Structure formats: C-alpha cells, structure tokens
Amino acid sequence: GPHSLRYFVTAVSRPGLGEPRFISVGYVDNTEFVRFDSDAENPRYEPRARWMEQEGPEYWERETQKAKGNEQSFRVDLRTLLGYYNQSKGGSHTIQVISGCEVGSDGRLLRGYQQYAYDGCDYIALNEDLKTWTAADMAALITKHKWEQAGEAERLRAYLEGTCVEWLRRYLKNGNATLLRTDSPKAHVTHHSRPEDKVTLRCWALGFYPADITLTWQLNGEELIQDMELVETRPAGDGTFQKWASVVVPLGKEQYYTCHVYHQGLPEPLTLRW
C-alpha cells in the first residue's frame, strides 16, 4: 500500500532557562526511525529503528549538522514571532512543523506537504500544488512574502518530489523486513458490570502492523459506530499497535453483539463475541 516519510519538528522557548528545546522526529509510516533532541550534553542525530544501521557515518554527520542548523534558525524564529505578535520575552512559545511526502505502492509521489503552527494554531502552509503558501493571519503573511521573494517554495518542492521520495523508497527497501511486514491483530473481548443492568463490552485488537485498522461492534447486522467508545490506535512499545472499542449493552444480551476487526493481515475480518 502507500507509505509516508514525515518529520515532526518542535521548538519551544524557555525564558530564564537558556536555549529553546528543539526536537526533530522522523517517521516512515507510523514507525519512528530517527530523532534529534537538543536536550543532551552532546545532541546527535540518532537511529530509532534497527534498519537505520544500514546508513553510513556520513548520513549521521550530515543530519546532525543540519539539526544544529535548525536549532539556530528556530531560535531566531521564536524571537521574530515575538515581534510579529507583539508578545513579551517572559513567556514560553511553541513552533511546530510537519513536513513530508507520501508515495503509492509503486513508489510514485502522491502528495507532499509542509505546515507550520505557532502556539498550537495554524501559521503557514504549503498549498497542495507545492507552488504557493497560504497564511493563517497577518504575521504569517509577512513570512509568506519573505519566502516568495526568496523562492523558498521551489526549493521545498524539489525536496518533496525528489529527495523526500528517493529516501523514502530507500528506507522502504532497507527496512523492508520491518516496514513491509504484516502482523495480524489478535483480538479478545472483556466484560464489565455497570449500574442499571448494563454491561460494558470491550473489544481489544493487539499486536498488529501496520497501524491502520477498523474495529466495529454490530447488533442485528448493523454497526453501532454511534454509541461506541474507542481510543485512537496506539503504539505498544515494540513497533506494533493496539486499539480497543467498547459498547454498553443490556445485561443478558451480550450474546447478540459482535466485534468485527478489519486489517490488512486479515483476508477475512475477525468476528468475536463475549
């Protein structure tokens, strides 16, 4: 299926406590594979996935140099934004950036993007055409004009359609045993009493990969997507994912409700009952 290469960048100022915290985390699909965190005596770009051992020392030296360059530019950004928004030097602020590209199963580009947020709000984003930017407010309109005069979109587009796609393909090749695998979900249902003769049925889906999955509860062949409660799919600590979905049913009727699990590793979806 399709795959993605994404970099999540966060820079946070801490007045009175020194330089801003700077973190850049890279993901292929939903698996963390590289990271840089400024909060270390000797911050270095580090592998977070076993297959990244396949890159030579130059990869790490280059990515580390680039990261240190980012710490500096984001430190400047935090100051600039204080001016744009007329804010004081006493408070902590956050800049976030998500950059990435996605390819189809054939390795061809599907889409690319880069979006910024300041204090958790949209700031500026590259439009889908990868040619122009859209600004969320007047401060971002200043940035838009700077980047247009400097021709930043063309350079970013070159990275998204070129470099980003090429490296994603290489990561998928180098880490194929990990990235292109399919671990089927193993599911079970738990039962919990409630007041008012009602029971909570919780359908668990464990040990699966990739992360995409669908858990539904049915009654009389129909989905109860409405009254269901669920958690966002989440990492389980070893590179696999987990998820649960619950529904509150009448006591004594548990038998009529079925959990359905749909996943890439299930030619036929799983059907369970308490």
Partner: peptide, 9 residues
C-alpha cells in the same frame, strides 16, 4: 533525509 533547512519566518 530531512529538509535541507527551514527558512526563517
């Protein structure tokens, strides 16, 4: 491989 750089705002 990460973006070459992030132009200042």
């Amino acid at each position: 491989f990460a973006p070459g750089n992030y132009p200042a705002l």
